[PDB]
Design a protein around this ligand. Structure first.
Ligand code: JX2
Ligand code: MG
Ligand code: ZN
Length: 333
């Protein structure tokens, strides 16, 4: 609940980032982290410089100090877990920026929707513990019991939304305080809709709803704009396979460690451990990444690009080149 201090803000403001272009599709967050012994300050500086460079906070009445306060209140609520940590949400922010401004998806949205998407990236996984929704339901954990008694099986995504609303309830960290009326209501409602759409159990229904709205935009522009926002946050969230191979591999190694730590905790509790969570099977990262590409990511990116996001064609080309690299790992074993 405590306010951000002047010392906390100066430690971010001093980071310079000399050799990096944070707007580039080949920006390497792993190298930016290695280039300093304060990587949490460098990650915060990347988010701050990307948002201020856009001119969007200035246009919407958000001061430089309220923006930095917001970034540092978000950083405080991420945990030291292998993948779902502050570096993941800064990476999703940076990646969404490239989709809007190098993929030209900004042409399909308002400037306010673009500002909301960059802000929502930073709140999307607040307080993640490296355990998925199925863990909380299968173990009858207290949060699983509350979800069940509530109605909603999106255990984590409702939790992330609750903490986003807490941060924004203080005017000193409220990046939407300069909005009023319909604009303020749209910022909150679109932020919450996008976070709830990141639950991978809704993946099929979110993709079908986007493709239907993209085929008939003028008959419901409100629905088309809302579904494009959901599909861009989702695209950012599964974007690791769209990156240069070595960046892609480092993310895959980090998600794999989280899956295995969940499996180990499921064994202690004597509950069912699905094979990809079982540290005892012969790991095999190339087989897992090819399966993720073939069943989830390749059909997602190819369909959204063919339906209307033509500027994002590089994502499809990189997924193909990364799949071919994983194939060669297997062919040379
Ligand atoms: C960098 O690679 C990755 C990035 C991300 C996710 C996420 N998975 N899933 C679900 C859980 C697995 C199956 C259902 C669909 C995907 C999540 O719900 C996570 C939370 C939010 C978004 C995506 C996350 C998984 C991988 C992988 C991998 C891998 O090597 N083998 C696993 C695999 C999956 C399919 C074939 O093989
Ligand atoms: Mg999530
Ligand atoms: Zn995420």
């Amino acid at each position: 609940v405590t306010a951000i201090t002047k010392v906390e803000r100066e430690a971010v403001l001093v980071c310079e980032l000399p050799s990096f272009d944070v707007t580039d599709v080949e920006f390497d967050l792993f190298r930016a982290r290695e280039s300093t012994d304060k990587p949490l300050d460098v990650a915060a500086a990347i988010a701050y410089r990307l948002l201020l460079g856009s001119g969007l906070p200035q246009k919407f009445g958000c001061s430089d100090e309220v923006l930095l306060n917001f970034i540092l209140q978000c950083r405080k609520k991420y945990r030291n877990v292998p993948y779902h940590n502050f570096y993941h949400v800064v990476d999703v922010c940076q990646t969404i920026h490239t989709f809007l401004y190098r993929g030209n998806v900004y042409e399909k949205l308002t400037e306010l929707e673009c500002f909301v998407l960059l802000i929502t990236a930073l709140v999307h996984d607040l307080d993640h513990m490296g355990l998925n929704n199925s863990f909380y339901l299968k173990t009858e954990s207290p949060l699983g019991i509350l979800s069940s008694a509530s109605g909603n099986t999106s255990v984590l995504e409702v939790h992330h939304c609750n903490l986003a609303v807490e941060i924004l309830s203080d005017p000193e960290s409220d990046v939407f305080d300069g909005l009023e009326g319909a604009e303020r209501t749209l910022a909150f409602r679109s932020m919450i809709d996008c976070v709830l759409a990141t639950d991978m159990a809704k993946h099929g229904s979110a993709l079908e709803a986007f493709l239907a709205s993209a085929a008939d935009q003028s008959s419901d522009e409100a629905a088309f704009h809302r579904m494009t926002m959901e599909i861009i946050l989702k695209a950012g969230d599964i974007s690791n396979v769209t990156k240069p191979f070595d960046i892609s591999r480092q993310w895959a190694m980090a998600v794999t460690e989280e899956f295995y730590r969940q499996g180990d905790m499921e064994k202690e509790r004597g509950v069912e451990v699905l094979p990809m969570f079982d540290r005892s099977k012969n790991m095999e990262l190339a087989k897992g990444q090819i399966g993720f590409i073939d069943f989830v990511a390749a059909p997602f990116f190819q369909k959204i690009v063919d339906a209307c996001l033509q500027g994002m064609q590089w994502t499809v080309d990189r997924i193909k080149s990364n799949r071919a690299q994983w194939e060669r790992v297997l062919e040379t074993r």
